[PDB]
Structures are given as C-alpha cells and as structure tokens.
C-alpha cells in the first residue's frame, strides 16, 4: 500500500515539475508576435465538381499522390476511386463488410487500404495483371474497431484501433512489427510526418501523444483539450499539428516546444469538429464542423476567413490535395464536392 | 465532340460502373436491417440460435421468412465506447432487445450492491432515449420464463423491486416487468415497443419479428406519402 502511495506522489511530483518546466519556457504568445502582418480579407471558394454516385453516408476519403485521383469509402459497401478532373469513376471495389470508417491511398498509387468496424484492415491491389482488383492482404490483429490507417510505405502500414493501441504492420509477412501503447481512451485519428519518421495519435480523452516508428516509444504528450480529440493533421513544416475536438475548439501545438500555441474558438459554434487539415503553405486551416458546413480558420490570426456552406448533412472527411490546387469535402449526404 | 478516341471509351466505363452501382443499390434497399442488443447474460445466443439460419467484431446473420430478407447485426464483441460507433446504425428498421426475467436475483460480478436487472433497465433507458434512435421502433424479448417461474415460486420479487403489492405469481409479475420496461420511453409519439415472451416454439418468435417489421413498414409507408 505504501509503495503504491509513494509511486503516486512521485508521479505527481514529476508531472508538477514538467508543468513548471513548460511554464518557464513561455514568454510570448503567438497572437502578440503575429500582430504586424497583413491578414487575408476573405476566402471565397466556389464548388467545381460534384462527385455523385454513393448511396449512403461517406466516412473517409484520401487524395492520391498525383493530385488527380481520390478514393472514398461509404456505408453501402463501395470503395469508388474517382477522377477529380473529369468526374469519371475508375474502380468500384466492393467490400466484405459494409461497415467502414477509414480508407487510404498508397503513395505509389498501387494499393488502397480500407478498415472499418470489423477490426480488419483489408489491402487491395489496383495494378493486377487481370482487369479486376484483388485483396492482397487481410490484416487481423486488433481487438477494438479500426478508426484510421495511413500508408507509411509501399510495404508498411500503421493503424489506429479503438482498443487504446496503435500498431505498425508488415504487408509482406502479415503480422504487426511494433505496437504503440500508452493511451487511456480510444484512438481515432493519426497523421504521418512529411519525412515519414514520426506520427501523432488523437485519443478520446483530451490527449495527444507523439510516437516514433523506429523505437516504438512515446516521446511527448500534449494536453489542453476539454472533451476529446477527433481529427489531427500535421503542419507542412513538420513541427506542428492541429487537433480537432467536440467542444467546438481546434488548437495548434508544437513539437520542439511541447506547449499549446493558439486556439481557434468562436462563440457562435457549439458543435463538434470532424476533420482538420492545413494548406500548402500552412496559412489556411480548413476545419469540418458537424453543423452542415466547414470553416476556413486562419492559422496565424485565429479568425474566420470564409465558410464553405455548400453541404446538406454533417461533413465527415475532407483533405487538401498535394499541390494545393483544390480541396474536397465529403458529407453524410453521399455527395463529394471539389472546392477551389 | 472535344473528347478524343479513347477518352470516349473511359466515359463509357463510368456509365457501366454507375449502372452496376444502381443495380446493386436496388437489391440491398429491399432487405430489412435490424440491430440486436442486450446484456452479457441476456441469452442473445439462444435467441439467434433458435431462429432459422441461412448464413470478434460485428457478426452479421442473414435469414429469410415469407419472402423477406432480414439482417441481424450482433455488436457484442465491441469493447470500445458505444458512443463512437452508434451513429452508423442510424438507418435501421428495428432494434431487437433481449432481457432475462430470471436475472433479477443474481447480482453483478465482482459486486454485491448492484443488480443486473437495474443495469439492463439503465441500458434500455439509454438506448431508447438516444438522439439517433428517435424514430426506430424497438422489439423487446423476455428470454427466460420457465426459469423465472421456478425462481419466483420460492423467492419473492420484492428483493429486486422494493415496490410491489401483488402476490408472488407470474401472471401479474410478468405484466409488472413489462409495464416497468414500457415506462422507460420518453419518445411516446414517434416509436413503439413491441413486447414478446420467448417460448420454446422457434416459429412463433420469427413470426412475431415478421409482424413487427411489417407494422413498422406500414407505418413508414403511411408517413412517407403524408397520409399520417
């Protein structure tokens, strides 16, 4: 009993010391420094394409490396691969279980993964010798439901399941290589680094941690949110990331200085945040709110600069393309739209 | 027109893909999807086993009856938070519920002051009054009745429910439990609760499920054309 008590008080003392060390390094906020710059007036974006054809809710989408192709997953059991320019479809990959919550597109354009509620990440092949698409691998090592998965490489994929863990897989062998543990709540968001060396995960209890894929250990942890985390995206520089939430608040953290920098909250929004993504130069922080419209929150000014209100139901996924030419938002009304 | 030779062929592929999507979209839209819920020892296995079968994580069960295709989703292996994956079941015809009558004198595991019947009542109150399941009816099943008879013939019901004036007979105790489960329904003008007592006859339960689904379909059709 006494050992547990001394361990708890030592942990509390270490947490307090970390808090004082984090407070001592704070001298000026981001708003005071970025006060002598010219802010953007208005960001008016008009829809260009309306990719229609789905027959149920849309839960995730990912842009290809060529900035031309995108894959979208829906509840009816389809994994259509659209063409952004001419609106045509390229594939109509069916699914085993019609309960999907994530999808990814390989950086080489060969494979496409799609997890879901069956806690199984299915990897499909698009460049087969035949004319159809086959299931190259079927990874099954998670207990809780799968939330999001991104391709670390053409042979390695990292997944974030609902059983408070994240794991790195090996498509060739079929078994996981490294298992990342430490989260207390459900992990439901992650994003890879530009150099593909580290990644962060967004838990379901007001927490975000930074992992390294080589050592498989927790380097830093970030707190400050109230309800939970719901979406994360890195800064194009690679030393910052923005975390959505459910209490109408998305904040910007920093890696070198493990401290919150700026929060984007408004008194008119009282609804959650489903998706967060940066821009090509890290100036516009698009956020997808579940009140049927998105936002174009500025990064260095913490003010709204536009509203993409052209949707019917809650938006659940959106991502800026690689070359920064257009954005795509997919909502629960089975309609994707390409803004520019 | 402005399209090249092989570009016109790529457009024809998109039309065939869309036609194949629309063909399969009209096949999965004519089958009844209904979710199955319950407690740990609520006898969901016996309920899903006594019915006819045609077919780790979600388990789907397919069966047909009177030219209708039913789908049974058994989300029992999901140990994660129910609040996160409950919005994908928004479009559903009914919600089967399983509760055990004989499970009222047996307390929870690793516990002594919490009763499992109260836990089942709390779960039903949380499911029926959820913000997503505001229009979907609920089919309620009382699994065990003979064991409940043998348990209540010797043990009084006042152990679980401290308010009870009737005798220690099953005829009124079943009605009391049913009425207690009916009162946990705030949305009294948008959904109904069909109660049935599970019997040894396998055909009767499937017939009751079919009747409830048909009544829900009739009500939805009446609400569709603005006639009700």
């Amino acid at each position, epitope marked *: 009993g006494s050992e547990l008590d001394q361990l708890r008080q030592e942990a509390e003392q270490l947490k307090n010391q970390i808090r004082d060390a984090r407070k001592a390094c704070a001298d000026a906020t981001l708003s005071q420094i970025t006060n002598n710059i010219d802010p953007v007036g208005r960001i008016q974006m008009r829809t260009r394409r309306t990719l229609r054809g789905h027959l149920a809710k849309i839960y995730a989408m990912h842009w290809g490396t060529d900035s031309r192709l995108l894959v979208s997953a829906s509840q009816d059991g389809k994994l259509i691969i659209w063409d952004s320019y001419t609106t045509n479809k390229v594939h109509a990959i069916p699914l085993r279980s019609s309960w999907v919550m994530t999808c990814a597109y390989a950086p080489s354009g060969n494979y496409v993964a799609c997890g879901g509620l069956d806690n199984i990440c299915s990897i499909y092949n698009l460049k087969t010798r*035949e004319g159809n698409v086959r299931v190259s691998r079927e990874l099954a090592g998670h207990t809780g439901y799968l939330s999001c998965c991104r391709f670390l490489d053409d042979n390695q994929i990292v997944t974030s399941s609902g059983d408070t863990t994240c794991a790195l897989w090996d498509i060739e062998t079929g078994q996981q290589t490294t298992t990342f543990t430490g989260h207390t709540g459900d992990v439901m968001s992650l994003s890879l680094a530009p150099d593909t060396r580290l990644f962060v995960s967004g838990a379901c209890d007001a927490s975000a941690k930074l992992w390294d894929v080589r050592e498989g250990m927790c380097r830093q942890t970030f707190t400050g949110h109230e309800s939970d985390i719901n979406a994360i995206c890195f800064f194009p520089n690679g030393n910052a990331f923005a975390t959505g939430s459910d209490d109408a608040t998305c904040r910007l953290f920093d890696l070198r200085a493990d401290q919150e920098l700026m929060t984007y909250s408004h008194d008119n929004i009282i609804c959650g945040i489903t998706s967060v993504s940066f821009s090509k130069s890290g100036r516009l922080l698009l956020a997808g709110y579940d009140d049927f419209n998105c936002n174009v929150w500025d990064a260095l000014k913490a003010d709204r600069a536009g509203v993409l209100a052209g949707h019917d139901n809650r938006v659940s996924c959106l991502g800026v393309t690689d070359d920064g030419m257009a954005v795509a938002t997919g909502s629960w009304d089975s309609f994707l739209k390409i803004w520019n | 027109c402005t399209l090249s030779a092989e570009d016109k062929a*790529a457009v*024809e592929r998109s039309k065939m893909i869309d036609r194949n999507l629309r063909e399969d979209g009209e096949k999965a839209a004519r089958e009844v999807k209904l979710l199955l819920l319950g407690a740990g020892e609520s006898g969901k296995s016996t309920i899903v086993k006594q019915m006819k079968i045609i077919h780790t994580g979600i388990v789907e069960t397919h069966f047909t009856f009177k030219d209708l295709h039913f789908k049974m989703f058994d989300v029992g292996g999901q140990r994660s938070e129910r609040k996160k994956w409950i919005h994908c079941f928004e479009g559903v015809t009914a919600i089967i519920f399983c509760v055990a009558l004989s499970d009222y004198d047996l307390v929870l595991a690793e516990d002594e002051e919490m009763n499992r019947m109260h836990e089942s009542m709390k779960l039903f109150d949380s499911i029926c009054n959820n913000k997503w399941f505001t229009d979907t009816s609920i089919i309620l099943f009382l699994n065990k009745k003979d064991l409940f008879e043998e348990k209540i013939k010797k043990s009084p019901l006042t152990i679980c429910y401290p308010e009870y004036a009737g005798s220690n007979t099953y005829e009124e105790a079943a009605a009391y439990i049913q009425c207690q489960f009916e009162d946990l329904n705030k949305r009294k003008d948008t959904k109904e609760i069909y109660t049935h007592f599970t019997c040894a006859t396998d055909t009767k339960n499937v017939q009751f499920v079919f009747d409830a689904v048909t009544d829900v379909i009739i009500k939805n059709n009446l609400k569709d054309c603005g006639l009700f």
Partner: single-chain antibody
Amino acid sequence: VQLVESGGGLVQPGGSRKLSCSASGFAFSSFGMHWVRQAPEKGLEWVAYISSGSGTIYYADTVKGRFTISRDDPKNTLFLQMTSLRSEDTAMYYCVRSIYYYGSSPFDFWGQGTTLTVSSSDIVMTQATSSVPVTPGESVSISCRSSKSLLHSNGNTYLYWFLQRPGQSPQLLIYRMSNLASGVPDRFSGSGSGTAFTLTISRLEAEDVGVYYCMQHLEYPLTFGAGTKLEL
C-alpha cells in the same frame, strides 16, 4: 492470361467459316476487344473493335458493312463472321484485348493468332526507313513520322509502339510517349514532339530483334506504319 484462336484454313471466295477465339485468365467481361490483320510479308492493319458490354461497335473503312462481329460474356468467346471474300483477305488474324481508363495500357497482351488463306482523311503513318544493318551493342534510333499532330488538348499524345518478334505475335513497349509497359526492360525509351517521333535503345542484344511498328490512336481509324526491320 492466354488467347488462342481457331477457325482458319483453305476456303473459296464467296463463303467462309467463322473466326472464333477463347479467352481464359482474366476478366473478359470488362475488356474491349480488337482485331488486327497481318498480311503475309507485309504490314498489319486494324479491322474492328467492340467496347465493353457490346456498347459501341465499329469497323474499318475497307470492310465496312462486310463483317459481322459479336462477343459472348458467359463462355468468354469472341466471334468474327465473314460475308464476302476477296483475293487480299488471305492473311494472319490476331485478337487483342484492351481496357480504357485513366492510367491504363491498351493492348498490352496480343496473343498467338491464326492463319487464313484464300485460293484464287485518315491519318497516314510512315516509317523513316525499311531495313538497316546493326551490330550488337549499338544505340539505334527508329523514327516514325505522322501526317497530323497527335498532341491533344488534354496534354498527352496517342502514339503507341510495339515490337514484332519473328515467329510470334508482337508485344507493346510504350503506350503514349515513353511509359514502358510491364515486363519490358529499361533499355527502351521514347520521345516525341507531336509530329516527328523517335525511339532510342541504349543496349542492343541478340534477344530483341524484329520489326518495329508505330500506331496512332487519336483519330479513330487506327493506322499502323510500314514497319522497320532490324538485321543482325
């Protein structure tokens, strides 16, 4: 993947048999099929084409309204019927598949082909030369000139290139400008400007020798070249 053909022999002018081929090893229900006739010791030309699902069917201007063609999805068999015969129809027929979507490589696999003997505006593609002697291990450039700018408003050309091996069916090398097909070595390379096109080979061995053919695809009346032969 395998494509075998049957229904050829010695026939009299006026009536003939039916040319049928069987497909086995891929999804035949989602591939557009072509037909390429190769005259004896001469050049090869296009005959007909069927879209996926028999949606659009077209023929060549020489045999327009004289041939009958159709698909069969259940048994994966392609049929071609002759109505009237001439003294020039004696040639070797080939049945080649093709699929058209963003990033696809049409007619990557040709097949084997069958023989047939008979007892008795459009874009013009021309080759630079006919036959040139070459030593092993020497970089050769084969040029094919077009009569029309094949560069489309999209940004990609439609000049396909394939090598004919003596004794079997040809195989594709590059499909639009330089993108090598799956299975060909890295020695082959392609380049062009829109009217004049060239193909450069880095290392020349004894395993890659034959006749080179250049084909356009912008205008729908497909036309091939005369053929450049390589002599060892």
